[PDB]
Design a binder for this molecule. Structure first.
Ligand SMILES: [Ca+2]
Ligand SMILES: [Ca+2]
Ligand SMILES: [Ca+2]
Ligand SMILES: [Ca+2]
Lengths: 61, 60
């Protein structure tokens, strides 16, 4: 925020300007966007099963 | 959870045949000759009504 290029600048999710992540502060952040391609099974009716993603850190520097 | 057989769809109509193909009403007359005479005379007519979607009739 104390430099020319970063005067009053925000960071938000691509394509969704109303969801601001960072505003006028130094917070290193990465945004992972998820998109699904699916084929439902024929005749199967289901209500509320979850889709679970697990993240495991391998190396850091 | 639920596995649908995808068969529970139906559409229904009706059919009927409540009338015979023809109706016959008679207006015939009489033959009144003398005993042993020879002649000819018109008797009358017979009306043959035709019913729904009937186009050709074969009678005996
Ligand atoms: Ca390390
Ligand atoms: Ca005779
Ligand atoms: Ca005669
Ligand atoms: Ca006919």
């Amino acid at each position: 925020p104390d430099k020319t290029g970063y005067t009053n600048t925000s960071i938000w999710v691509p394509g969704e300007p109303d969801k601001i992540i960072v505003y006028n502060e130094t917070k290193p952040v990465a945004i992972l966007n998820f998109k699904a391609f699916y084929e439902a099974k024929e005749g199967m009716l289901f209500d509320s099963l979850p889709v679970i993603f697990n993240f495991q850190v391998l190396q850091v520097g | 959870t639920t596995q649908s057989p995808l068969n529970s769809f139906y559409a229904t109509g009706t059919a009927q045949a409540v009338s015979e193909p023809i109706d016959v009403e008679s207006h015939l007359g009489s033959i009144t000759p003398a005993a042993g005479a020879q002649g000819s005379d018109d008797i009358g007519y017979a009306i043959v009504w035709i019913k729904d979607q009937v186009n050709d009739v074969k009678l005996k």
